[PDB]
């Protein structure tokens with residue numbers, strides 16, 4: 001069976017972590033609230049069995065995820081607070097995001113208000129800007145990897161498909177994994193780089209504003225076909241300024257897309273209301289953004 005220890009001890013740092021509440025599953029890993037024994041601070045513990053890491057290739061993917069994630073420190077990226085292992089498990093200590101992710105928000109609220117979309121997209125773009133200037137491509141930006149802390153701040157997580165650009169102009173030929181919002185250049189296997197993430201943010205923007213993903217079908221391969229043909233439409237109730245930015249990001253040609261550093265200067269952000277924060281009620285009830293209590 002091989003059960004997870006009730007107390008996770010890091011022998012290098014001499015820190016101990018009591019395994020608290022179960023949070024969920026994702027790939028080979030399980031997620032638990034874990035609490036430092038001395039400071040009582042709580043983290044998300046990502047725990048993956050070494051019994052599912054028997055092949056060197058799977059081991060190397062895990063190592064690479066740690067190597068990338070540990071090098072990152074930004075407000076809109078899931079904090080990496082450490083890692084260690086025993087003979088049976090790999091333990092990664094991550095920033096705890098108590099309000100789950102944008103997937104659970106989307107399932108409850110469907111299409112958000114425009115100001116909410118601006119708020120979230122701004123923080124996603126800021127996180128991705130940081131990744132890209134550090135030559136990191138996430139390659140799997142989706143609603144479920146965009147986690148929310150107690151103040152509804154976005155933190156990009158799951159660097160299991162992420163890769164480092166080692167030299168200028170490098171085109172990655174291989175993506176081992178199946179991204180949700182997969183770019184057309186990946187589907188055709190032509191070569192790809194940072195633009196992959198801008199495509200994904202384009203899909204996220206569409207999903208947040210429209211209430212469903214732009215290329216959704218019954219069959220996943222039929223969906224890949226639609227992405228190849230650029231077969232999507234934006235409903236007419238979507239405001240033209242938002243629709244224009246979606247159209248820029250969802251171009252088949254990767255060079256035609258805007259870069260991540262162009263995005264916040266777009267009219268979608270600069271000409272609209274971006275709230276400084278969102279109340280907790282926004283998880284469940286549309287905000288009207290009233291000027292005063294009545």
Ligand SMILES: CN1CCN(c2ccc(C(=O)Nc3n[nH]c4cn(C(=O)Cc5cccs5)cc34)cc2)CC1
Pocket residue numbers: 021022023024025026027029030031044045046047078094095096097098099100147157158
């Ligand atoms: C007890 N309830 C359950 C329902 N609620 C939550 C359910 C899940 C979560 C949650 O996943 N929080 C996370 N915080 N930080 C992270 C990095 N994560 C991953 O890398 C993703 C994964 C790492 C390992 C496997 S998947 C995932 C997180 C918070 C609350 C409220 C509390």
Ligand SMILES: [Zn+2]
Pocket residue numbers: 057176177
């Ligand atoms: Zn592979």
